[PDB]
Scaffold this active site. Structure first.
Site, PDB file in Angstrom:
ATOM      1  N   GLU A   1       0.179   5.910  11.089  1.00  0.00           N
ATOM      2  CA  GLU A   1       1.050   4.891  10.284  1.00  0.00           C
ATOM      3  C   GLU A   1       2.532   5.239  11.100  1.00  0.00           C
ATOM      4  O   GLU A   1       2.789   5.815  12.088  1.00  0.00           O
ATOM      5  CB  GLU A   1       1.119   5.164   8.948  1.00  0.00           C
ATOM      6  CG  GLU A   1      -0.001   4.479   8.221  1.00  0.00           C
ATOM      7  CD  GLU A   1      -0.100   2.983   8.260  1.00  0.00           C
ATOM      8  OE1 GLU A   1       0.780   2.292   8.097  1.00  0.00           O
ATOM      9  OE2 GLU A   1      -1.490   2.389   8.693  1.00  0.00           O
ATOM     10  N   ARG A   2       3.593   4.330  10.564  1.00  0.00           N
ATOM     11  CA  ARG A   2       4.991   4.467  11.241  1.00  0.00           C
ATOM     12  C   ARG A   2       5.558   5.781  10.983  1.00  0.00           C
ATOM     13  O   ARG A   2       5.666   6.327   9.920  1.00  0.00           O
ATOM     14  CB  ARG A   2       5.821   3.362  10.459  1.00  0.00           C
ATOM     15  CG  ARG A   2       5.200   1.898  10.476  1.00  0.00           C
ATOM     16  CD  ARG A   2       6.271   0.793   9.926  1.00  0.00           C
ATOM     17  NE  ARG A   2       5.656  -0.695   9.836  1.00  0.00           N
ATOM     18  CZ  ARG A   2       4.468  -0.935   9.271  1.00  0.00           C
ATOM     19  NH1 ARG A   2       4.040  -0.206   8.084  1.00  0.00           N
ATOM     20  NH2 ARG A   2       4.196  -2.189   9.432  1.00  0.00           N
ATOM     21  N   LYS A  41       0.837  -1.207   0.000  1.00  0.00           N
ATOM     22  CA  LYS A  41      -0.050   0.056   0.033  1.00  0.00           C
ATOM     23  C   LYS A  41       1.014   1.157   0.106  1.00  0.00           C
ATOM     24  O   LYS A  41       0.529   2.200  -0.711  1.00  0.00           O
ATOM     25  CB  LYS A  41      -0.804  -0.104   1.179  1.00  0.00           C
ATOM     26  CG  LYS A  41      -2.046  -1.018   1.143  1.00  0.00           C
ATOM     27  CD  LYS A  41      -3.216  -0.744   2.269  1.00  0.00           C
ATOM     28  CE  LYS A  41      -2.476  -0.584   3.513  1.00  0.00           C
ATOM     29  NZ  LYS A  41      -1.996  -2.001   4.114  1.00  0.00           N
TER      30      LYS A  41
HETATM   31  N1  LIG Z   1       6.318  -2.366  -6.013  1.00  0.00           N
HETATM   32  C1  LIG Z   1       6.949  -3.466  -5.311  1.00  0.00           C
HETATM   33  N2  LIG Z   1       7.913  -4.348  -5.750  1.00  0.00           N
HETATM   34  C2  LIG Z   1       8.429  -5.037  -4.937  1.00  0.00           C
HETATM   35  N3  LIG Z   1       8.148  -5.343  -3.616  1.00  0.00           N
HETATM   36  C3  LIG Z   1       7.165  -4.717  -3.082  1.00  0.00           C
HETATM   37  C4  LIG Z   1       6.428  -3.596  -3.815  1.00  0.00           C
HETATM   38  N4  LIG Z   1       5.619  -2.988  -3.064  1.00  0.00           N
HETATM   39  C5  LIG Z   1       6.027  -3.527  -1.491  1.00  0.00           C
HETATM   40  N5  LIG Z   1       6.842  -4.663  -1.780  1.00  0.00           N
HETATM   41  C6  LIG Z   1       7.304  -5.410  -0.751  1.00  0.00           C
HETATM   42  O1  LIG Z   1       6.313  -5.441   0.304  1.00  0.00           O
HETATM   43  C7  LIG Z   1       6.962  -4.618   1.591  1.00  0.00           C
HETATM   44  C8  LIG Z   1       6.427  -3.078   1.513  1.00  0.00           C
HETATM   45  O2  LIG Z   1       5.110  -3.160   1.660  1.00  0.00           O
HETATM   46  P1  LIG Z   1       4.381  -1.830   2.317  1.00  0.00           P
HETATM   47  O3  LIG Z   1       4.110  -1.118   1.092  1.00  0.00           O
HETATM   48  O4  LIG Z   1       4.881  -1.387   3.681  1.00  0.00           O
HETATM   49  O5  LIG Z   1       2.775  -2.477   2.643  1.00  0.00           O
HETATM   50  P2  LIG Z   1       1.879  -1.677   3.610  1.00  0.00           P
HETATM   51  O6  LIG Z   1       1.877  -0.309   3.472  1.00  0.00           O
HETATM   52  O7  LIG Z   1       0.583  -2.231   3.212  1.00  0.00           O
HETATM   53  O8  LIG Z   1       2.457  -2.292   4.988  1.00  0.00           O
HETATM   54  C9  LIG Z   1       8.602  -4.573   0.943  1.00  0.00           C
HETATM   55  O9  LIG Z   1       9.543  -5.490   1.923  1.00  0.00           O
HETATM   56  C10 LIG Z   1       8.523  -4.955  -0.303  1.00  0.00           C
HETATM   57  O10 LIG Z   1       9.406  -6.325  -0.588  1.00  0.00           O
HETATM   58 MG   LIG Z   2       1.273   0.981   4.929  1.00  0.00          MG
END
Ligand SMILES: Nc1ncnc2c1ncn2[C@@H]1O[C@H](COP(=O)(O)OP(=O)(O)O)[C@@H](O)[C@H]1O
Ligand SMILES: [Mg+2]
Ligand SMILES: Nc1ncnc2c1ncn2[C@@H]1O[C@H](COP(=O)(O)OP(=O)(O)OP(=O)(O)O)[C@@H](O)[C@H]1O
Ligand SMILES: Nc1ncnc2c1ncn2[C@@H]1O[C@H](COP(=O)(O)OP(=O)(O)O)[C@@H](O)[C@H]1O
Ligand SMILES: [Mg+2]
Ligand SMILES: [Mg+2]
Lengths: 483, 40, 469, 53, 469, 128, 160, 128, 28
Positions: free
Chosen positions: E180-181, E154
């Site tokens: 969020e973080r 996300k």
């Molecule tokens: N476009 C992308 N390409 C490769 N890996 C991704 C991508 N988006 C997310 N990830 C994977 O997911 C993790 C980050 O997700 P994140 O954006 O923090 O999700 P959320 O915000 O829902 O927690 C990373 O460790 C990465 O490996």
């Molecule tokens: Mg997030």
């Protein structure tokens, strides 16, 4: 006589005192009872004050005098706690006299904002092959250790603490890491074994133990992780780095639930309070990496969660996973097979796999990540002769991820053991003999070939000369091993 | 519903995913050989 | 000082005083009753009134009935004279053999052993049961937990351990009948007089009995667990002996707490349980442990509500145990006894450093092939055994032979089973399963492994079956 | 051999469907047990919440 | 007017006024505090007393502490001075760059635009992502939603849209760190200085910043989205220009409300949420939209607890959105990034009259084969790929290639993947998937289409894979 | 009355399932914490104190006995339900009855596998 | 689509023709539309007669449109009409309740609104007693009998 | 109004799912007793009385009509959920729509197997 | 599934009979 700075107990039951008086008392202020026991003023109501009791409440009768400390709940901090074992409030409980703390930090301080923080750079070496390679933990990061009961959750934390002896005994100041083990709920006998283990491995001299066991009241189990966090923030702010382990946050939530429900606060999901996410979010957020301006120090967190029957979708587990920077899914299925530690590679993630890995490890780990990923896709079988040897590699590499307890390996040593499997010196060798292979191989390399390990640490990578030396060592060792 | 077997994530789902991966690995090798032929 | 009863709702009773209000935990003697009724103070409601829990039936109580204060908690007799005697929740003798004459007493409530007083020595305990010693072996001076649903085999298993371990052990023992069948109390009492571990005429008894069965009210069943616990504490601390505590069933301590928490005016927790479920167990379970001076090896039977291990009561106890023994119904219904689940039971001493590298390697091998066998159940159900791979047939074959070899005839089970009970040594157990994993008995049938002692008697049993022509 | 395999595949798939039917029946009972338990548990949380106000 | 505090329980605080009673949604200044502590009125309890919610920690507060009524809601700085500056939920700056001297203020609470003010000008917005622009393309001046579970991408997805759209966008932008973080807040603030969207030494900042992360209390996190969108209202209303409103994460608005629902005196709704869910969301959501005067193009990140779309929080949000991007974990675990579900993510502008017949027919063609591919997977699970017909083998082949061609590497996510980021045009996406469905890439392998930009790079990658093999 | 006065009696509760539902009504109307299937915490205690009164008295106490035959109604053969497992954990064995065997024609439809008698094996004629 | 109303009218007709006892239909919580359909079908069949006093059916209705309290005690209103023909005239009476599930949920709705802690699956605490006090009245006395055909809608196809 | 003046009308509730959520919110804040899924006791009666008003009048009462097309939002195609089952049991038939049929190409995605109209089969032109 | 156990137990009862046949002929 006085009702401004003093109060009387209206009712007391289940460690919850309702105090008449205490008009000038603050929210979350510590208060002393007539018996000697202390308490925390959480609920401020018009006609009474809801006070939780820290310890047994058999001594607290009705109409007992309740004084004021005139200060928010705090705990002792500093470098004097290193070596000692303490309770939630910060009192000595190991029979080695009273420790002399210089400062006293507040338990419920806000986490550092956006400006003081800086991206994670330097690595936090656990000394575990599977962790440092695939799920690399950087300093300031928060990495969740989730899994069922008896699946090597606490064992991961113990090996991490013992691994820091390599850095702390040395001269390099920045690479040191002071540990803080917080015990929530688990019985004293278990905690006594952990201290005995750390004592025997010369680990206690740079480690702090905050013990809040099942015999202790819920407020102590509730407060213990925050008390430990404050002790770690001392280092964080003042240049140094620290490591904290909450074992575990599931048993903390149960205490917070009990504490809350007895204060007549309405229940929520699974009888837990409404702000159980706020409970763990504010605790974990305090773990961070400070920039050079504010100090340069950091605080690395390792929370623990106990899932019921592998249900990560449960209420409390789903909360902590969204908070933490990454998670390490431990599984019973792999644990029973023999794969210990039982770290699921496909599901576990760090989300900072770049700076957290050393340049030497990045070579072998990056290629191992790809081969294991391709292997798990074509796993459920044991034909095409090309992909026949691919299924072997995965089984060979998975046997290298096995690791005995209380034996964390160095970053340079982990690259050596992976070099054999990744280049294909274990392909013809039988899967069952790899544990015996690596045992002798690691002990041999450390004994005689010290300069090769030293050159990898010096250069910080696998050089062409060092690559050529390993090429001849593994081939000669393999030939000697078989024949 | 359609695709309910793989949504479950059990023996049949994982073995089906592995079956597809194997088949298309073999066909990927054959097609790479076809690219060798057209290039040469 | 005298106190007046102001409210009575079930087990919970409210007593008011004019002066000299008694503190929490203190016992109160209710006057004007034929049998000795006891009220333990729980809360202080306010207005010189205290909430109490009755250790016996509250029928016949009138509002305004006088209640005296003893000035202390429930104090009970403890010593060598408690051996061979049956006690109730409030210390009284319930075996019709006069009073228990002792030179010292002890309160049922006490603080748990401090951190400095804890012990470190973790030594293995050999039971004789194959599934136990291989997968989740028990430890001397530890905390053993026997989980199991309704009628899976907890009371049989605990009696086997008492028959084997408590008989061959130079030390005292304690049995705590907490909220279980009174019939089983009568059977155990006479069985122990028969064997010799209890003696009526002589003073050479090894077992100390404490009973608060399912016919008792919730106040008794909630506190009788502590009564028997306090007996074991005496022998641990003041004598420095190796004690064996046997609680059946520990769940009833928590269940009884749930019945009173409603009436104590608390907000209920998950699944209708008390909010103080972990802490009430914590203060109790922490007292049952091996200190520096003495030692206690507790074997606790644990009931599992509706075969659900995620239930709060059994879920909480797992942390307080060293070795766990999860008895499954599905395993019992197949005929495999004892029905110990090999992919659920666990132990902390299961480590190559403690049990040895050969023990640990063979232990994981059994669990590995059992897990692989369980993973192919969906494939065998729909498609069949013919659809499986040729090499997978070998893994399914051995697992079923391993499952049946984990079963074992019991000594106490002789009376109804008929087959003679077996007692397999440790080294013979590891050898037996290792041969099956290596493939040294793939030619033999499965039913040869079902209900036998060592591996030698399994091969001899196959020759007996070979003589059906 | 052609007539042998078609007769065997007929009965093999017939058994697969009948074995599947039995698993559906038992899972449908386990589904309805868990269906009711969720409805009861969620409701007790709401009653627990309202009483504490 | 003066008002003294009478009670404090958690985030909730009760203040009693003597005569002048403040309305609901009014900012109350707590005197005798080191840091500023704003309290917002939620209810009127009666007897000249009101219940409030704290915007920061309530520790230190005393009964009888004086609190003054501001005479208005929480008013914040609004204008060009807020650009390139971080601020609290209450309005104060927290980037250590002095006060934000704005000439005009604005309250965070306001009535939403009426039915007459609503516009119906649907226009496609080209982002650069293939799976988005093909299947569920965003509307220029519309409400975009990014549903996803724990760690499905996300934050990576929304941060890419900021990097791609804001640069091409000739106007302003707003970001809201709702619960969020704070690590993510640190990572975003620094990289925007590097890209040059927020300049330091001179006032040429494009993006504005508002923050209230998960270290903050519920009352804070429940009002950050309102504080964030109120800035976007100023750039919509006063200045007749377009504006972007990024939010992460909007779920924490609804979560934070339920954390104080019990303490406010409310009977809890289903799945632990507050009963005021649809209305509390409604009064906030409809303020974030395009009027006839201006145009907000919002991008809201939505957390989905336990990947449960049937959960009240995410389920209610679907009605407020025009374009949606539903992220699946099953797709993420394969390696397909962004893990966008092609049979779930949809948009209102997906129509042959709106975006042309060629755009519609191809997009539907992709969803047709991917839906049929799910039905074939059930057949393959029993039979296998080999037993299928010639027709069905090709459908699966085209389906697997289309799945991988939907994936794409981002410029924001270079360290994660390793490869450089891409940005595919509109017509390249429509024509790219059209050639695959037509059957003009049967000879090529599926690996060449995994993680690439346009269809040209898939052919170019096939040349590398041929020479390497 | 018979038990204590050196006589033997049989008692049959038909059924304790319907009694538990009636006691649940009393508990839910009294407003007390409901647990599994909305039953109170002491629904076990309800049946436990009842059944233990059935016993075998020795010659010192008359030599009589009371024999209990309680009944429970399962829903679709759910043997591991809340109330059934409580009565199984009290009684000295049980007699499971299958819907399949009963419909098929086998009457009485006793499940041989699950049905067991603990103390009945001792109190049985040698001819049997 | 299975001849449900046709079966009901025949049972009404045959029991009246053979055993010489009148019938009672209790519309409980179903559609008013369906009541209109049944009423006119009975007139066209003959079991109800507007012209003369030879009708065999006594109709009692309390459908969806009426509140919980009204719907809760419609079955009692109809039952009492059937009780007259049994007790006073000594007949073999035929009662019909459609739907019996509506009587249950009406009782569940009343119990909820009154302020009672719901039992398992959200039903009332007094589920057995409310059903018991109604059903036990439908029996064979020494004077006559009331045989009741009750339409059952099983919710979620779950007999448990 | 149209119904009672000899004219025909068509009402469409879009949707009754969100109506229940608003009605739930309203009752819970008034401190009325909660029920299943936090909805008030008479949540069935809410939609029942609403829908019952939709009817077809005879010549004697004007001859008008009011047709009702209510809408319900299911969760993952679950027709057996609490609110859907209530509205399904009230109406004279239903038109079930699947997400699977939509993406396959069938639009409108009307499940012919499950969708039925009991009353409207008679009210139809003979040509059709 | 019950018929899973039926098919499995049938298969291994047949193979148990084969193993007892080989065992007895070898015993002779
Ligand atoms: N476009 C992308 N390409 C490769 N890996 C991704 C991508 N988006 C997310 N990830 C994977 O997911 C993790 C980050 O997700 P994140 O954006 O923090 O999700 P959320 O915000 O829902 O927690 C990373 O460790 C990465 O490996
Ligand atoms: Mg997030
Ligand atoms: N790598 C390993 N090799 C051998 N044994 C291991 C390994 N990891 C764990 N174990 C064994 O597993 C047991 C349980 O591990 P651990 O102490 O981590 O439990 P846990 O998962 O933290 O849960 P709990 O603390 O509640 O038991 C230990 O006693 C240890 O002997
Ligand atoms: N080792 C065993 N071998 C054979 N049968 C057993 C064994 N253990 C228990 N059982 C059977 O299980 C039944 C119940 O045992 P018990 O210990 O009373 O269960 P619980 O204590 O769980 O109620 C006994 O009647 C007995 O037939
Ligand atoms: Mg642990
Ligand atoms: Mg038992």
């Amino acid at each position: 006589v006085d009702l401004e700075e003093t109060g009387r107990v209206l009712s007391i039951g289940d460690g919850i005192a309702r105090v008449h008086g205490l008009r000038n008392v603050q929210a979350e202020e510590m208060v002393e009872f007539s018996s000697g026991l202390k308490g925390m003023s959480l609920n401020l109501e018009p006609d009474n004050v809801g006070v939780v009791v820290f310890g047994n409440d058999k001594l607290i009768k009705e109409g007992d005098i309740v004084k004021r400390t005139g200060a928010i709940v705090d705990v002792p901090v500093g470098e004097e706690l290193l070596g000692r074992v303490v309770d939630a409030l910060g009192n000595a409980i190991d029979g080695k006299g009273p420790i002399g703390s210089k400062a006293r930090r507040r338990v419920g301080l806000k986490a550092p904002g956006i400006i003081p923080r800086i991206s994670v750079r330097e690595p936090m070496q656990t000394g575990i092959k599977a962790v440092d390679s695939l799920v690399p933990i950087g300093r300031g990061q928060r990495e969740l250790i989730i899994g069922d009961r008896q699946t090597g959750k606490t064992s991961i934390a113990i090996d991490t603490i013992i691994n820091q002896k390599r850095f702390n005994d040395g001269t390099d100041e920045k690479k040191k890491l002071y540990c803080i083990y917080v015990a929530i709920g688990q019985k004293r006998s278990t905690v006594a074994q952990l201290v005995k283990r750390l004592t025997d491995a010369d680990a206690m001299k740079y480690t702090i133990v905050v013990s809040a066991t099942a015999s202790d009241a819920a407020p102590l189990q509730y407060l213990a992780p925050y008390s430990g966090c404050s002790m770690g923030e001392y280092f964080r702010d003042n240049g140094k780095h620290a490591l904290i382990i909450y074992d575990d946050l599931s048993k903390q939530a149960v205490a917070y639930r009990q504490m809350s429900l007895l204060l007549r606060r309405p229940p929520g999901r699974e009888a837990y309070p409404g702000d159980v996410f706020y409970l763990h979010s504010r605790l974990l957020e305090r773990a961070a990496k400070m920039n050079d301006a504010f100090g340069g120090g950091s605080l690395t967190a390792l929370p623990v969660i106990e899932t019921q029957a592998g249900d990560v979708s449960a209420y409390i587990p789903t909360n902590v996973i969204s908070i933490t920077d990454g998670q390490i899914f431990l599984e019973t299925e792999l644990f029973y097979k023999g794969i210990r530690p039982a770290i699921n590679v496909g599901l576990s993630v760090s989300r900072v796999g770049s700076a957290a890995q050393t340049r030497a490890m990045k070579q072998v780990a990056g290629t191992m990540k790809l081969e294991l990923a391709q292997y798990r896709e074509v796993a459920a079988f044991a034909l095409d002769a090309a992909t026949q040897q691919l299924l072997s590699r995965g089984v060979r590499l998975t046997e290298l991820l096995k690791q005995g307890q209380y034996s964390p390996m160095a970053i340079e040593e982990q690259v050596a053991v992976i070099y054999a499997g990744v280049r294909g010196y274990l392909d013809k060798l039988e899967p069952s003999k790899i544990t015996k292979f690596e045992n002798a191989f690691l002990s041999h390399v450390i004994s005689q070939h010290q300069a090769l390990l030293g050159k990898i640490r010096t250069d910080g990578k696998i050089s062409e000369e060092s690559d050529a030396k390993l090429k001849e060592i593994v081939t000669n060792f393999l030939a000697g091993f078989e024949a | 519903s359609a695709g309910a077997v793989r949504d479950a994530g059990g023996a049949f789902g994982k073995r089906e995913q592995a079956e597809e991966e194997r088949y298309f690995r073999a066909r990927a090798a054959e097609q790479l050989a076809a690219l060798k032929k057209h290039h040469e | 000082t005298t106190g007046r009863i102001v409210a009575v709702i079930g087990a919970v009773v409210d007593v008011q005083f004019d002066e000299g209000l008694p503190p929490i935990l203190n016992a109160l003697e209710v006057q004007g009753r034929e049998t000795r009724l006891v009220l333990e103070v729980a809360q202080h409601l306010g207005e010189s009134t205290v909430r109490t829990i009755a250790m016996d039936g509250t029928e016949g109580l009138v509002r305004g009935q006088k209640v005296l204060d003893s000035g202390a908690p429930i104090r009970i007799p403890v010593g060598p004279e408690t051996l061979g005697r049956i006690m109730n929740v409030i210390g009284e003798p319930i075996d019709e053999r006069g009073p228990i004459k002792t030179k010292q007493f002890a309160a049922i409530h006490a603080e748990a052993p401090e951190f400095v007083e804890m012990s470190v020595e973790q030594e293995i305990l050999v039971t004789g049961i194959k599934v136990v010693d291989l997968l989740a072996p028990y430890a001397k001076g530890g905390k053993i937990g026997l989980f199991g649903g309704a009628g899976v085999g907890k009371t049989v298993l605990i009696m086997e351990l008492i028959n084997n371990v408590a008989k061959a052990h130079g030390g005292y023992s304690v049995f705590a009948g907490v909220g279980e069948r009174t019939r089983e109390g009568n059977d155990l009492y006479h069985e122990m007089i028969e064997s010799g571990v209890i003696n009526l005429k002589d003073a050479t008894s090894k077992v100390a009995l404490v009973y608060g069965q399912m016919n008792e009210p919730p106040g008794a069943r909630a506190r009788v667990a502590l009564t028997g616990l306090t007996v074991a504490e005496y022998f641990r601390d003041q004598e420095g002996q190796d004690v064996l505590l046997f609680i059946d069933n520990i769940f009833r301590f928590t269940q009884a707490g749930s019945e009173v928490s409603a009436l104590l005016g608390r907000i209920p927790s998950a699944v209708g349980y008390q909010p103080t479920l972990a802490t009430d167990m914590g203060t109790m379970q922490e007292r049952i442990t091996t200190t520096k001076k003495g030692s206690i090896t507790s074997v606790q039977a644990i009931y599992v509500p509706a075969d659900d291990l995620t239930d709060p009561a059994p879920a909480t106890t797992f942390a307080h145990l060293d070795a766990t023994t999860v008895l499954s119904r599905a395993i019992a219904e197949l005929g495999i006894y004892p029905a110990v689940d090999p992919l659920d039971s666990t132990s902390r001493i299961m480590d190559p450093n403690i049990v040895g590298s050969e023990h640990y390697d063979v232990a994981r091998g059994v669990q590995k092939i059992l897990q692989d066998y369980k993973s192919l159940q969906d494939i065998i159900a729909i498609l069949g055994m013919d659809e499986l791979s040729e090499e997978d047939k070998l893994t399914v074959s051995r697992a079923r032979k391993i499952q049946r070899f984990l079963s074992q005839p019991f000594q106490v089970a002789e009376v109804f089973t008929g087959h003679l009970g077996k007692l397999v040594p440790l080294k013979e157990t590891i050898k037996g399963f290792q041969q099956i994993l290596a493939g040294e008995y793939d030619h033999l049938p499965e039913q040869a492994f079902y209900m036998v002692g060592p591996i030698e008697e399994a091969v001899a049993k196959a020759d007996k079956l070979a003589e059906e022509h | 051999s052609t007539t042998s395999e078609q007769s065997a595949r007929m009965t093999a798939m017939d058994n697969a469907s009948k074995n599947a039917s039995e698993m559906i029946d038992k899972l449908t009972l386990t589904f309805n047990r868990t269906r009711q338990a969720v409805i009861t548990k969620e409701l007790i949380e709401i009653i627990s919440g309202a009483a504490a106000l």
